[PDB]
Amino acid sequence: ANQASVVANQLIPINVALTLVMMRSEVVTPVGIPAEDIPRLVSMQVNRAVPLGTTLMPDMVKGYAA
C-alpha cells in the first residue's frame, strides 16, 4: 500500500513513555499503528521493549485503542 505505520526510531525500553523522537513513519509489512496517530501516542507507555526499526503494534501500547 501507500499505508505507512509507526516504526521505532530508537530502542524504546520497557515501560517508557513514548516521545516524538522515538517514532518515525514507514511503509512496512505487517501494518501496525497508522502513522497518522503519532500525535496521540505521546506520553503513553509501551508494555515491552521495542528495538530500533520495530513496527509498533496496538498491543504494545498501554491504554491504546484504535
Side-chain angles (χ1 to χ4, degrees), residues 1 3-66:
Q3 192 54 238
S5 307
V6 186
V7 175
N9 190 237
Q10 57 170 73
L11 170 91
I12 306 170
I14 188 171
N15 296 142
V16 69
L18 259 26
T19 68
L20 241 38
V21 80
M22 305 172 180
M23 293 174 283
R24 62 189 185 223
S25 178
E26 272 180 81
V27 178
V28 287
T29 35
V31 182
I33 296 166
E36 59 192 271
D37 294 354
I38 284 161
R40 47 176 274 264
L41 283 183
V42 182
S43 307
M44 293 175 77
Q45 299 161 247
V46 293
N47 62 7
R48 74 193 75 186
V50 183
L52 166 64
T54 294
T55 307
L56 261 183
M57 293 297 165
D59 60 301
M60 298 172 183
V61 185
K62 293 177 174 180
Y64 178 90

Short mmCIF file of all heavy atoms in Angstrom, two decimals, unseen atoms left out:
data_model
loop_
_atom_site.label_atom_id
_atom_site.label_comp_id
_atom_site.label_asym_id
_atom_site.label_seq_id
_atom_site.Cartn_x
_atom_site.Cartn_y
_atom_site.Cartn_z
N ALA A 1 0.85 -1.18 0.00
CA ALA A 1 0.00 0.00 0.00
C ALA A 1 0.89 1.23 0.00
O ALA A 1 2.09 1.14 -0.23
CB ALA A 1 -0.89 0.05 1.27
N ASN A 2 0.22 2.36 0.20
CA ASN A 2 0.88 3.60 0.49
C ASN A 2 0.81 3.74 2.03
O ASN A 2 1.40 4.65 2.61
CB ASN A 2 0.11 4.69 -0.28
N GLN A 3 0.13 2.83 2.75
CA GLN A 3 -0.10 2.90 4.19
C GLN A 3 1.14 2.69 5.02
O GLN A 3 1.66 1.57 5.13
CB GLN A 3 -1.14 1.85 4.63
CG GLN A 3 -1.65 2.05 6.06
CD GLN A 3 -2.20 3.45 6.30
OE1 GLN A 3 -1.75 4.20 7.18
NE2 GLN A 3 -3.15 3.94 5.52
N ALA A 4 1.56 3.82 5.58
CA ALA A 4 2.68 3.92 6.49
C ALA A 4 2.32 3.64 7.96
O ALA A 4 1.27 4.10 8.46
CB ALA A 4 3.26 5.33 6.38
N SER A 5 3.17 2.97 8.72
CA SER A 5 2.98 2.69 10.13
C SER A 5 4.05 3.41 10.93
O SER A 5 5.01 3.98 10.39
CB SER A 5 3.14 1.22 10.44
OG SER A 5 2.37 0.32 9.66
N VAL A 6 3.82 3.36 12.26
CA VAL A 6 4.72 3.89 13.26
C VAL A 6 5.85 2.87 13.45
O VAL A 6 5.61 1.70 13.77
CB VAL A 6 3.94 4.10 14.64
CG1 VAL A 6 4.88 4.79 15.63
CG2 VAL A 6 2.72 5.00 14.49
N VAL A 7 7.10 3.27 13.32
CA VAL A 7 8.25 2.37 13.46
C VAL A 7 9.15 3.04 14.50
O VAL A 7 9.32 4.27 14.53
CB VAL A 7 8.98 2.23 12.05
CG1 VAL A 7 10.25 1.41 12.18
CG2 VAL A 7 8.10 1.50 11.05
N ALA A 8 9.72 2.25 15.42
CA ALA A 8 10.66 2.78 16.40
C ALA A 8 11.93 3.35 15.74
O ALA A 8 12.60 2.73 14.90
CB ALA A 8 11.08 1.66 17.37
N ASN A 9 12.25 4.58 16.09
CA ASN A 9 13.42 5.28 15.59
C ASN A 9 14.62 5.13 16.52
O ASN A 9 15.72 5.59 16.26
CB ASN A 9 13.05 6.71 15.43
CG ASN A 9 14.09 7.52 14.69
OD1 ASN A 9 14.59 8.51 15.20
ND2 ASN A 9 14.47 7.23 13.45
N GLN A 10 14.41 4.45 17.63
CA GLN A 10 15.40 4.08 18.62
C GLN A 10 14.81 2.92 19.41
O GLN A 10 13.61 2.59 19.29
CB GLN A 10 15.69 5.21 19.60
CG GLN A 10 14.47 5.73 20.37
CD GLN A 10 14.83 6.69 21.51
OE1 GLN A 10 15.22 7.84 21.28
NE2 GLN A 10 14.71 6.19 22.76
N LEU A 11 15.63 2.27 20.22
CA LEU A 11 15.12 1.23 21.10
C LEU A 11 14.34 2.00 22.16
O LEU A 11 14.85 2.96 22.78
CB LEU A 11 16.21 0.45 21.83
CG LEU A 11 15.68 -0.45 22.91
CD1 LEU A 11 15.36 -1.82 22.41
CD2 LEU A 11 16.71 -0.54 23.96
N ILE A 12 13.09 1.59 22.28
CA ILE A 12 12.19 2.15 23.24
C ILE A 12 12.20 1.08 24.32
O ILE A 12 11.71 -0.02 24.10
CB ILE A 12 10.83 2.29 22.60
CG1 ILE A 12 10.83 3.07 21.29
CG2 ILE A 12 10.00 3.04 23.61
CD1 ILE A 12 9.46 2.96 20.56
N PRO A 13 12.81 1.33 25.50
CA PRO A 13 12.86 0.37 26.58
C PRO A 13 11.49 0.14 27.21
O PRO A 13 10.60 1.00 27.14
CB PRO A 13 13.92 0.91 27.55
CG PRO A 13 13.90 2.36 27.32
CD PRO A 13 13.62 2.50 25.82
N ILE A 14 11.30 -0.98 27.91
CA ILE A 14 10.01 -1.35 28.51
C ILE A 14 9.68 -0.33 29.56
O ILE A 14 10.53 0.19 30.30
CB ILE A 14 10.10 -2.75 29.12
CG1 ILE A 14 8.72 -3.21 29.57
CG2 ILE A 14 11.18 -2.78 30.20
CD1 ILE A 14 8.64 -4.67 30.01
N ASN A 15 8.41 -0.06 29.44
CA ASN A 15 7.68 0.85 30.30
C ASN A 15 7.99 2.31 30.16
O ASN A 15 7.50 3.14 30.94
CB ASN A 15 7.82 0.46 31.80
CG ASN A 15 7.23 -0.90 32.22
OD1 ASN A 15 7.83 -1.59 33.04
ND2 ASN A 15 6.11 -1.43 31.73
N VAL A 16 8.74 2.69 29.13
CA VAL A 16 8.99 4.09 28.94
C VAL A 16 7.81 4.71 28.20
O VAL A 16 7.08 4.07 27.43
CB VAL A 16 10.34 4.27 28.15
CG1 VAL A 16 10.13 3.79 26.79
CG2 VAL A 16 10.70 5.68 27.76
N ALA A 17 7.58 5.98 28.49
CA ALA A 17 6.59 6.80 27.83
C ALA A 17 7.18 7.41 26.54
O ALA A 17 8.25 8.02 26.47
CB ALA A 17 6.15 7.87 28.81
N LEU A 18 6.43 7.11 25.47
CA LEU A 18 6.71 7.50 24.11
C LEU A 18 6.88 8.97 23.90
O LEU A 18 6.05 9.77 24.37
CB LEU A 18 5.59 7.01 23.26
CG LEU A 18 5.68 5.76 22.40
CD1 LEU A 18 6.68 4.76 22.91
CD2 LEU A 18 4.27 5.26 22.30
N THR A 19 7.93 9.37 23.20
CA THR A 19 8.08 10.77 22.81
C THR A 19 8.23 10.76 21.30
O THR A 19 8.56 9.75 20.65
CB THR A 19 9.32 11.39 23.45
OG1 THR A 19 10.45 10.77 22.84
CG2 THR A 19 9.40 11.15 24.94
N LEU A 20 8.07 11.94 20.71
CA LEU A 20 8.12 12.14 19.27
C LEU A 20 9.44 11.80 18.60
O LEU A 20 9.42 11.47 17.42
CB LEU A 20 7.77 13.55 19.04
CG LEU A 20 6.59 13.93 18.24
CD1 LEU A 20 5.34 13.09 18.36
CD2 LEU A 20 6.36 15.30 18.78
N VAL A 21 10.56 11.86 19.33
CA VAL A 21 11.85 11.45 18.82
C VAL A 21 11.89 9.93 18.60
O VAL A 21 12.63 9.43 17.77
CB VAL A 21 13.01 11.89 19.82
CG1 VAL A 21 13.20 10.96 21.03
CG2 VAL A 21 14.31 11.84 19.02
N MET A 22 11.09 9.16 19.32
CA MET A 22 11.11 7.72 19.21
C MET A 22 10.36 7.19 18.02
O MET A 22 10.52 6.01 17.68
CB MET A 22 10.50 7.08 20.47
CG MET A 22 11.17 7.53 21.77
SD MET A 22 10.29 6.94 23.22
CE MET A 22 11.29 7.62 24.52
N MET A 23 9.51 8.00 17.36
CA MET A 23 8.61 7.46 16.36
C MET A 23 8.76 8.00 14.96
O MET A 23 8.62 9.22 14.75
CB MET A 23 7.19 7.68 16.84
CG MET A 23 6.78 6.88 18.11
SD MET A 23 5.13 7.33 18.74
CE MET A 23 5.38 8.86 19.57
N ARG A 24 9.10 7.13 14.00
CA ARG A 24 9.12 7.54 12.59
C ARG A 24 7.95 6.87 11.87
O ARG A 24 7.23 6.04 12.43
CB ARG A 24 10.47 7.17 11.94
CG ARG A 24 10.92 5.73 11.83
CD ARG A 24 12.40 5.62 11.34
NE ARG A 24 12.87 4.23 11.09
CZ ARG A 24 14.08 3.74 11.45
NH1 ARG A 24 14.97 4.50 12.10
NH2 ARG A 24 14.39 2.46 11.16
N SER A 25 7.76 7.18 10.60
CA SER A 25 6.66 6.71 9.77
C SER A 25 7.29 5.94 8.64
O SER A 25 8.17 6.52 8.02
CB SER A 25 5.90 7.90 9.19
OG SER A 25 4.81 7.64 8.29
N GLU A 26 6.91 4.71 8.32
CA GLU A 26 7.44 3.96 7.19
C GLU A 26 6.43 2.97 6.65
O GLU A 26 5.62 2.43 7.41
CB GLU A 26 8.59 3.11 7.50
CG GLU A 26 9.96 3.66 7.43
CD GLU A 26 10.85 2.51 7.82
OE1 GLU A 26 11.14 1.67 6.97
OE2 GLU A 26 11.20 2.46 8.98
N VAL A 27 6.51 2.69 5.35
CA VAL A 27 5.68 1.70 4.71
C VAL A 27 6.35 0.35 5.00
O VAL A 27 7.35 -0.02 4.40
CB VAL A 27 5.62 2.01 3.22
CG1 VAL A 27 4.81 0.99 2.45
CG2 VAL A 27 4.92 3.33 3.05
N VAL A 28 5.86 -0.38 6.01
CA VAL A 28 6.40 -1.68 6.41
C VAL A 28 5.31 -2.73 6.38
O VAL A 28 4.15 -2.34 6.33
CB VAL A 28 6.98 -1.59 7.84
CG1 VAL A 28 8.30 -0.81 7.78
CG2 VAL A 28 5.98 -0.90 8.81
N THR A 29 5.63 -4.02 6.30
CA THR A 29 4.66 -5.09 6.47
C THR A 29 5.20 -5.98 7.59
O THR A 29 6.41 -6.25 7.62
CB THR A 29 4.44 -6.06 5.25
OG1 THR A 29 5.63 -6.28 4.52
CG2 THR A 29 3.39 -5.49 4.38
N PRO A 30 4.35 -6.52 8.49
CA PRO A 30 2.93 -6.19 8.58
C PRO A 30 2.62 -4.77 9.08
O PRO A 30 3.46 -4.04 9.61
CB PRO A 30 2.41 -7.33 9.44
CG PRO A 30 3.56 -7.69 10.33
CD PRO A 30 4.70 -7.67 9.34
N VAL A 31 1.39 -4.35 8.82
CA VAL A 31 0.97 -2.99 9.15
C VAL A 31 0.75 -2.90 10.65
O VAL A 31 0.20 -3.84 11.24
CB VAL A 31 -0.30 -2.69 8.33
CG1 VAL A 31 -0.84 -1.28 8.51
CG2 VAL A 31 0.11 -2.83 6.87
N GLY A 32 1.19 -1.82 11.30
CA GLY A 32 0.97 -1.68 12.73
C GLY A 32 0.11 -0.47 12.96
O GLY A 32 -0.81 -0.20 12.17
N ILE A 33 0.38 0.28 14.01
CA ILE A 33 -0.36 1.52 14.30
C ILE A 33 -0.17 2.50 13.13
O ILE A 33 0.97 2.63 12.65
CB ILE A 33 0.14 2.18 15.62
CG1 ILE A 33 -0.17 1.21 16.76
CG2 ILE A 33 -0.52 3.54 15.85
CD1 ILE A 33 0.53 1.51 18.10
N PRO A 34 -1.23 3.13 12.59
CA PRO A 34 -1.15 4.03 11.46
C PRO A 34 -0.29 5.24 11.80
O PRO A 34 -0.41 5.80 12.89
CB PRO A 34 -2.62 4.32 11.19
CG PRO A 34 -3.33 3.06 11.57
CD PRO A 34 -2.63 2.82 12.88
N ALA A 35 0.58 5.69 10.90
CA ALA A 35 1.48 6.78 11.21
C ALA A 35 0.78 8.06 11.61
O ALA A 35 1.31 8.83 12.42
CB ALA A 35 2.35 7.03 10.03
N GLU A 36 -0.46 8.27 11.14
CA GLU A 36 -1.28 9.44 11.49
C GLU A 36 -1.51 9.68 13.01
O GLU A 36 -1.64 10.80 13.50
CB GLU A 36 -2.62 9.29 10.76
CG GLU A 36 -3.36 8.02 11.13
CD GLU A 36 -4.56 7.62 10.26
OE1 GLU A 36 -5.68 8.06 10.57
OE2 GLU A 36 -4.38 6.85 9.31
N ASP A 37 -1.45 8.56 13.74
CA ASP A 37 -1.59 8.51 15.16
C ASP A 37 -0.38 8.85 15.95
O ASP A 37 -0.54 8.92 17.18
CB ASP A 37 -2.06 7.14 15.57
CG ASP A 37 -3.45 6.81 15.08
OD1 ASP A 37 -4.14 7.65 14.51
OD2 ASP A 37 -3.87 5.68 15.28
N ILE A 38 0.79 9.11 15.35
CA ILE A 38 1.96 9.50 16.16
C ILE A 38 1.68 10.67 17.15
O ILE A 38 2.10 10.56 18.31
CB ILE A 38 3.16 9.82 15.17
CG1 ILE A 38 3.71 8.49 14.68
CG2 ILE A 38 4.31 10.57 15.83
CD1 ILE A 38 4.55 8.57 13.40
N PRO A 39 0.95 11.76 16.82
CA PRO A 39 0.40 12.72 17.77
C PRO A 39 -0.24 12.17 19.06
O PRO A 39 0.17 12.51 20.18
CB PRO A 39 -0.61 13.53 16.94
CG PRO A 39 -0.04 13.58 15.56
CD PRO A 39 0.57 12.18 15.47
N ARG A 40 -1.18 11.24 18.90
CA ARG A 40 -1.87 10.80 20.06
C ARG A 40 -1.29 9.61 20.79
O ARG A 40 -2.00 9.02 21.61
CB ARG A 40 -3.32 10.54 19.70
CG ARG A 40 -3.71 9.76 18.46
CD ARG A 40 -5.24 9.58 18.42
NE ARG A 40 -5.60 8.40 19.20
CZ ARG A 40 -5.79 7.21 18.61
NH1 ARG A 40 -5.67 7.06 17.29
NH2 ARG A 40 -5.99 6.12 19.36
N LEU A 41 -0.01 9.34 20.58
CA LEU A 41 0.72 8.26 21.22
C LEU A 41 1.68 8.85 22.23
O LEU A 41 2.12 8.17 23.15
CB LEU A 41 1.53 7.43 20.20
CG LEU A 41 0.89 6.40 19.27
CD1 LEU A 41 1.96 5.73 18.45
CD2 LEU A 41 0.15 5.35 20.10
N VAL A 42 2.03 10.13 22.15
CA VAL A 42 2.96 10.74 23.07
C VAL A 42 2.42 10.62 24.50
O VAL A 42 1.22 10.82 24.74
CB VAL A 42 3.13 12.20 22.67
CG1 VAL A 42 4.13 12.90 23.57
CG2 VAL A 42 3.57 12.24 21.23
N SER A 43 3.33 10.26 25.40
CA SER A 43 3.08 10.06 26.83
C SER A 43 2.50 8.73 27.18
O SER A 43 2.36 8.45 28.36
CB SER A 43 2.12 11.08 27.45
OG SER A 43 2.59 12.40 27.15
N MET A 44 2.12 7.89 26.22
CA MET A 44 1.60 6.55 26.51
C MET A 44 2.78 5.62 26.67
O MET A 44 3.83 5.90 26.09
CB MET A 44 0.69 6.08 25.38
CG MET A 44 -0.52 6.98 25.41
SD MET A 44 -1.69 6.74 24.08
CE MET A 44 -2.55 5.28 24.56
N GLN A 45 2.69 4.58 27.47
CA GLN A 45 3.84 3.73 27.65
C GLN A 45 3.69 2.48 26.82
O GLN A 45 2.57 2.08 26.49
CB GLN A 45 4.01 3.27 29.05
CG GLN A 45 4.23 4.38 30.02
CD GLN A 45 3.93 3.87 31.42
OE1 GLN A 45 2.96 4.31 32.03
NE2 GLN A 45 4.67 2.94 32.01
N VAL A 46 4.85 1.89 26.55
CA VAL A 46 4.91 0.64 25.84
C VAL A 46 5.00 -0.41 26.89
O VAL A 46 5.55 -0.14 27.95
CB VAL A 46 6.12 0.51 24.93
CG1 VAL A 46 5.89 1.55 23.85
CG2 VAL A 46 7.48 0.70 25.66
N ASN A 47 4.53 -1.61 26.61
CA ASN A 47 4.49 -2.66 27.63
C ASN A 47 5.55 -3.73 27.43
O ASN A 47 5.55 -4.78 28.09
CB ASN A 47 3.06 -3.31 27.66
CG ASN A 47 2.65 -4.01 26.37
OD1 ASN A 47 3.45 -4.15 25.42
ND2 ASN A 47 1.40 -4.41 26.22
N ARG A 48 6.48 -3.41 26.54
CA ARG A 48 7.60 -4.29 26.25
C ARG A 48 8.65 -3.41 25.59
O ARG A 48 8.36 -2.27 25.20
CB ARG A 48 7.18 -5.44 25.30
CG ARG A 48 6.96 -5.00 23.87
CD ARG A 48 6.25 -6.06 23.10
NE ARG A 48 4.87 -6.03 23.51
CZ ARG A 48 4.01 -6.95 23.08
NH1 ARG A 48 4.40 -7.92 22.24
NH2 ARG A 48 2.74 -6.92 23.50
N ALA A 49 9.86 -3.93 25.52
CA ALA A 49 10.97 -3.26 24.83
C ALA A 49 10.74 -3.29 23.31
O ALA A 49 10.32 -4.32 22.77
CB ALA A 49 12.25 -3.99 25.21
N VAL A 50 10.88 -2.18 22.60
CA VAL A 50 10.69 -2.14 21.15
C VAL A 50 12.07 -1.80 20.59
O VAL A 50 12.58 -0.71 20.80
CB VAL A 50 9.60 -1.06 20.79
CG1 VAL A 50 9.27 -1.00 19.32
CG2 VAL A 50 8.33 -1.46 21.50
N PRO A 51 12.79 -2.73 19.99
CA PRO A 51 14.04 -2.48 19.27
C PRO A 51 13.96 -1.45 18.13
O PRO A 51 12.89 -1.26 17.52
CB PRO A 51 14.44 -3.85 18.77
CG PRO A 51 13.76 -4.82 19.73
CD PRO A 51 12.41 -4.16 19.95
N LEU A 52 15.04 -0.74 17.80
CA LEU A 52 15.08 0.16 16.66
C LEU A 52 14.61 -0.56 15.41
O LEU A 52 15.02 -1.70 15.16
CB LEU A 52 16.49 0.65 16.49
CG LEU A 52 16.98 1.35 15.23
CD1 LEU A 52 16.28 2.68 14.97
CD2 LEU A 52 18.47 1.58 15.42
N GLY A 53 13.73 0.10 14.65
CA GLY A 53 13.22 -0.44 13.41
C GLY A 53 12.02 -1.36 13.59
O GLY A 53 11.58 -1.91 12.57
N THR A 54 11.49 -1.60 14.79
CA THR A 54 10.35 -2.47 15.03
C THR A 54 9.05 -1.72 14.76
O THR A 54 8.91 -0.57 15.18
CB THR A 54 10.34 -3.01 16.52
OG1 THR A 54 11.51 -3.85 16.65
CG2 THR A 54 9.14 -3.89 16.88
N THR A 55 8.09 -2.32 14.03
CA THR A 55 6.81 -1.66 13.88
C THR A 55 6.05 -1.66 15.22
O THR A 55 6.06 -2.67 15.93
CB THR A 55 5.94 -2.35 12.82
OG1 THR A 55 6.76 -2.43 11.65
CG2 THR A 55 4.60 -1.61 12.53
N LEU A 56 5.41 -0.55 15.59
CA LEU A 56 4.66 -0.50 16.83
C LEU A 56 3.27 -0.99 16.51
O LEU A 56 2.57 -0.47 15.64
CB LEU A 56 4.53 0.89 17.40
CG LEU A 56 5.45 1.34 18.51
CD1 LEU A 56 5.02 2.75 18.91
CD2 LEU A 56 5.35 0.46 19.75
N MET A 57 2.92 -2.02 17.26
CA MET A 57 1.65 -2.68 17.17
C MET A 57 0.74 -2.22 18.30
O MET A 57 1.22 -1.84 19.39
CB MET A 57 1.85 -4.20 17.25
CG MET A 57 2.58 -4.80 16.06
SD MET A 57 1.67 -4.56 14.53
CE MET A 57 2.97 -4.95 13.40
N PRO A 58 -0.59 -2.29 18.10
CA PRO A 58 -1.60 -1.83 19.07
C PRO A 58 -1.46 -2.44 20.46
O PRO A 58 -1.55 -1.74 21.48
CB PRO A 58 -2.91 -2.16 18.39
CG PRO A 58 -2.56 -2.00 16.92
CD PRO A 58 -1.23 -2.71 16.85
N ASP A 59 -1.13 -3.73 20.48
CA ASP A 59 -0.89 -4.47 21.71
C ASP A 59 0.39 -4.10 22.49
O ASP A 59 0.57 -4.52 23.65
CB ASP A 59 -0.93 -5.96 21.35
CG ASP A 59 0.07 -6.51 20.32
OD1 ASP A 59 0.12 -6.08 19.18
OD2 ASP A 59 0.79 -7.44 20.64
N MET A 60 1.27 -3.27 21.92
CA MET A 60 2.48 -2.88 22.61
C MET A 60 2.16 -1.60 23.34
O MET A 60 2.94 -1.21 24.22
CB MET A 60 3.63 -2.59 21.65
CG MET A 60 4.08 -3.76 20.80
SD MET A 60 5.30 -3.34 19.53
CE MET A 60 5.42 -4.93 18.79
N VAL A 61 1.08 -0.86 23.07
CA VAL A 61 0.94 0.38 23.81
C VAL A 61 -0.13 0.24 24.86
O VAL A 61 -1.24 -0.24 24.60
CB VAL A 61 0.63 1.49 22.82
CG1 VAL A 61 0.61 2.79 23.58
CG2 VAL A 61 1.72 1.62 21.75
N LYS A 62 0.25 0.61 26.05
CA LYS A 62 -0.63 0.59 27.22
C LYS A 62 -1.70 1.65 27.09
O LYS A 62 -1.43 2.82 26.84
CB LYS A 62 0.11 0.88 28.50
CG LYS A 62 1.08 -0.16 28.90
CD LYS A 62 1.73 0.42 30.14
CE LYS A 62 2.67 -0.60 30.78
NZ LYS A 62 3.28 -0.03 31.96
N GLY A 63 -2.95 1.20 27.21
CA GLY A 63 -4.06 2.11 27.10
C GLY A 63 -4.45 2.46 25.68
O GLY A 63 -5.40 3.24 25.54
N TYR A 64 -3.79 1.95 24.62
CA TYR A 64 -4.17 2.30 23.25
C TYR A 64 -5.34 1.46 22.78
O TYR A 64 -5.34 0.23 22.83
CB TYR A 64 -3.04 2.05 22.22
CG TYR A 64 -3.33 2.35 20.74
CD1 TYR A 64 -3.10 3.59 20.16
CD2 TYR A 64 -3.81 1.32 19.95
CE1 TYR A 64 -3.34 3.79 18.81
CE2 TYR A 64 -4.05 1.52 18.61
CZ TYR A 64 -3.82 2.75 18.04
OH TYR A 64 -4.01 2.87 16.66
N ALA A 65 -6.28 2.18 22.22
CA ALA A 65 -7.34 1.53 21.48
C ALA A 65 -7.36 2.35 20.18
O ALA A 65 -6.87 3.49 20.23
CB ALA A 65 -8.59 1.67 22.34
N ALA A 66 -7.86 1.80 19.05
CA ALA A 66 -7.82 2.38 17.68
C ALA A 66 -7.66 3.85 17.31
O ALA A 66 -8.45 4.70 17.76
CB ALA A 66 -9.06 1.95 16.89
#
